[PDB]
């Protein structure tokens, strides 16, 4: 669990489906 | 340990299946709909934030990690969810199960578990990872059982009919087995002893046996059809009756196609239940009877017939799967061709303008080539299966005759016995063929049953709320929003913290622009949704406590996009309320200005209404809706602008209706123009999720605020 | 004389079918496509004006009369075409043939011929009559032909495969005949005389005979499948290649679905043109051979087999029609249920607001009841057929044994011949059963072939014109419209004969608003539709007499709505023109300013567009289209600026580009706003199909005309 | 010849399905 952290804005922009 | 991956039931549920699979990988099974609603899947797709949200509530200590180019270190706990863009068309989600020795194993929800190497996989997925870990406050539990157990509950009340199929089914074969023996009798009693009169008698005897058999077949089939109809109708009707009693978020999540396809899914279960519950009960018994009888007839050739069946079953099982994969590939490529044909036909204007007919013709020819290659490849698979079945079916018969003859020569069995045996082999071969052929039916039926039962188990709208009805007879009171906050879904909350007050029996207007949830407040007051923070106070009482049915029957709402159902005006206007007299209907038509376009109609009593009729105009539809709203005769009404068809003249009639209603009723109008709201007692301006200020026209103009700028923009 | 009615192929084809039926009643059979052309049927329906105009064009003296309620006057000649409002949703057109004893006969194209009484007919139809009479200009002729004869021309070059299939099938039946005699050989010699050494050898020989039979079946099946795929692909490609070259009016007339469905219809006739011809060639001859074999085997038993076949044929031909009548009704009722269910899922907002879910549930239940009633009604007839066939089969089977036993006891044949005949009955019964069962396939395949081929017989778009291209190879010249009037079909003319001039290498703008044309004139210049009165003049030559390929390749067009095809930008830009270097593409991207968009893309020009450029914005799509127009480097350019997304950010870029053309190429601009046309040299306003004035901006402002009011409204 | 004469525009209004 040492990977680079990702912000919540990218999580919102991540539109999977 | 064991690897698990859950398929897709629909097409938009890529995100939910991954989380379900990860949960099952740690001993947590949940109905896919119940995790689907929790993660808040939308029509377009699933945002990773929803996955993290459902994960951290479920027990997993999730983390949203920006996956780098190198993700090979043995530091984070496997398995983990990854996001990919499949062939650069649309986003999708998979899960990474095992990473070792330059090999990646991904449990794609679309397919089975598939293996990639470093380069080809690393090319396709654009970073991003979701770490999941079952830390504290986690428990291994399963909330899902077997759906078929529920569905047999529909078969149980219809029990008496089933036995009538079963009781007849025995008396069928009990005659048929006799009917086969004729060929033996002839070759024993008649060929050698030339008993003419006995021949005449036995001919009629076996004839009447056969006609009795056919009559019993008819009687069985009629009952089978009737039972199938009953079961199918009951299943569809129960599902459709249950669907209507769900909150709106279910309907906003899915589309209309995924609710209609459930009806074909239910039709599939009729065939599944009927075929299984008949065959498993009758054909195995017929096979047992046939096997015992033929074992009495001859032991060795029974073992011959047994190996015949074993080989046939092996051939069917080995070819079951590749046929399915080829069929799936064909079905994909056919649609991928249909898309190109439709696009070319649509854009033939540009094609002819630029003169590029060869460019499209060659591409279509290449795609047709792919379709035909797939079709021939699968056709060869059927050819192989048919040839391998025919080899067994024929060589078995030839060796059966050979063994029968060899036993005859040895002096162990007679020719009549051989012929009766060969004729009766049907009653032991065909039932087993039916039993083997039914395995794909159960395989697809269990999936269909789960897909339909997930919707059924989901919570109904009425059950969620808590009621206190006898205390409050009357709706009347002040409308207030206390620190109410709302979000549609995983989307950023459109509605923020607001504070609003509405007195008794006053005219109120709501003005908003650029889609700031101006109509959202009307639906929230209609209690289609529930505010997670804040509350709505009426008569000093929170809405959640008041009975839902009385609210929904005593709130008036007119949709911004009016909808009318096909039928007749007489019943369509009084939708919801029965036992309605014509007097109040015509008074409502007078006050709603609806009667003046009734004379031109063919028949006033029976004006047949069509869906999307050319006669119907949106102004008339909205007038009809306003007529229904006034016919509901409430004290609380919500209305939206006509926005067309001479709004100026309709304004006079609307003002006549509201003023002429002659009661202390509350009305909320939502519009984007300030012309009619001048005389409104109280107007509320909504900007980007916040009520800027509350008041009337005069002081808002005097306030020198933004409302001044919009008013100057208007004029 | 008998009554002949033409059946409808498409749903919106009721007007033309009646006219075709009348034409055949007067002995003029001509293809329905050529009727549908001159009638000018559109997507919505058929105007009676079109019917009358077409009838007058053919030679039928046509009179349109409002049919009175009292229609017992035998003063006008029959038959006659009239409308019927069968349901409120759809009007319809039918033909009334004759009146006898107050009973009318009506040939509904939807459903054959139906008879009505005075009470129920007058209720359904609305006053309408079109009297048609041969006015000495009509001629009894025939233009229609046998289409399957044309389609066999694709089968003719495939002589090798068909001959190989025929030979293999003949050998298959020969081997079957040889192998069928095993029972006779067994019960004549082998069992009676006990020759084990002979028994083993004969069994092995017949096993290898059967194995060879199965191998021959496999080899035949592979060739049959390959031949079917080849003929199917050839038909579909020929159809598409022909369809792509038609004038646009065909595509405006029909929907996309009615063009796509012909692809399924092609695979509908592949099976006919292959299987039917193969069965006719093979099974008939094989049944003949079996007939002689059985005839020399036995005569009376052959007569028994013939009466069995006769009964089978009688039953099949009796129940052929009612099963179709039930099937069509089930299809209609199922579609009616589905539409009314989708109408219920969509209107969730109303159905939950008014509390009327019971009202929709009851209606859906009463509709599902009707669906099941229709299905059960069909099921009864199906099971009647199934039981009646089985009765014949079984009674024939028993009677054959009875007759054989009588013959052997009386001493005409031996025991073995009876069972040999029972074994050999397959090769004489199954081919004849296939012959009888094949009839509905041909019955529907002939209609499918006609529906597909009527399109193919239509004249394509190239040969309508007559050109002299060698004299003029250059587009350059003055554009002139003189007395030009064009109409889409049989509706009100959109344009009226006008006088317009466009000079060489000069900047001209054409503004059109309030529903006025701005694209009709452009497509008319593009030679999409043939002008009826007047001509379009270029450099002292009418465009009609120049090669169409050059003209479309020398005029660049930008439609109001843009279309992007599924693929990559690299090939999307140079659509229709290969042998293109990257240098001029990059230059065009400079003048099109698409470069600002390519850097952020992952691939520069190899970036795949997901689905018709769904990711792009319409403003960006328009810019890409501009680049396509520029790549042609055409003499004439036609642009339609974006409505609102120009934002005056790409507007200056477009002005710079059009200034930077730096050649005397003609430029045409169409827009609905007057902001930028100030720099344009000449501007023309089209009002209700009229160029009232022609000039530059300053003079038009000085005129204080309607253009001045439009400018003041704009600013 | 019996019946009321129909104008061309009424004929144009006459629509089928
Ligand atoms: N399925 C949905 N239907 C409607 N709005 C949705 C939906 N999903 C998300 N939203 C969001 O909900 C918010 C409020 O939608 P609402 O229907 O109240 O629009 P509105 O304020 O009436 O706008 P408009 O007047 O432009 O229709 C918007 O920001 C919209 O993007
Ligand atoms: N083949 C056709 N081409 C164009 N318009 C047609 C055609 N058939 C019928 N119409 C109708 O003719 C009318 C006028 O069409 P026209 O080409 O003048 O459009 P327009 O006013 O320029 O509209 P837009 O600016 O949206 O292109 C429309 O109502 C349209 O539906
Ligand atoms: Mg809205
Ligand atoms: Mg236009």
Residue numbers in the entry:
A (entry chain D), D (entry chain C): 8 to 24
B (entry chain B), C (entry chain A): 8 to 722
Give sentences copied directly from the paper behind this entry.
Peptidase-containing ABC transporters (PCATs) in gram-positive bacteria function both as maturation proteases and exporters for biofilm formation, quorum sensing, or antimicrobial polypeptides. Substrates of PCATs are synthesized as precursors with an N-terminal leader peptide. Proteolytic cleavage of the leader peptide at the conserved double-glycine motif is necessary for secretion of the cargo peptide. In this work, we determined the structures of wild-type PCAT1 (wtPCAT1) in the presence of substrate and ATP with or without Mg2+.
To analyze the conformational states of PCAT1 under ATP turnover conditions, cryo-EM samples were prepared using wtPCAT1 mixed with twofold molar excess of the substrate CtA, 10 mM ATP-Mg2+, and the creatine phosphate ATP-regenerating system. Among the 671,000 particles analyzed by three-dimensional (3D) classification, ∼83% exhibit IF conformations with different degrees of NBD separation, 14% are in an NBD-dimerized configuration, and the remaining 3% do not show any protein features. Subsequent refinement resulted in a low-resolution (6.6-Å) NBD-dimerized structure and three molecular structures of NBD-separated IF conformations, referred to as IF wide (IFW, 4.1 Å), intermediate (IFI, 3.7 Å), and narrow (IFN, 3.7 Å), respectively. The three IF structures share a similar overall conformation, in which the two PEP domains dock symmetrically onto the intracellular openings of the TM cavity. The leader peptide (residues 8 to 24) of the substrate forms an L-shaped structure wrapping around the PEP domain. The double-glycine cleavage site (G23/G24) is positioned on a narrow cleft on PEP in close proximity to the catalytic triad residues C21, H99, and D115. Densities consistent with ATP and Mg2+ were observed in all three reconstructions. The majority of PCAT1 adopts an IF conformation in which the NBDs are separated, the substrate is enclosed inside the TM cavity, and the PEP domains remain associated with the transporter core.
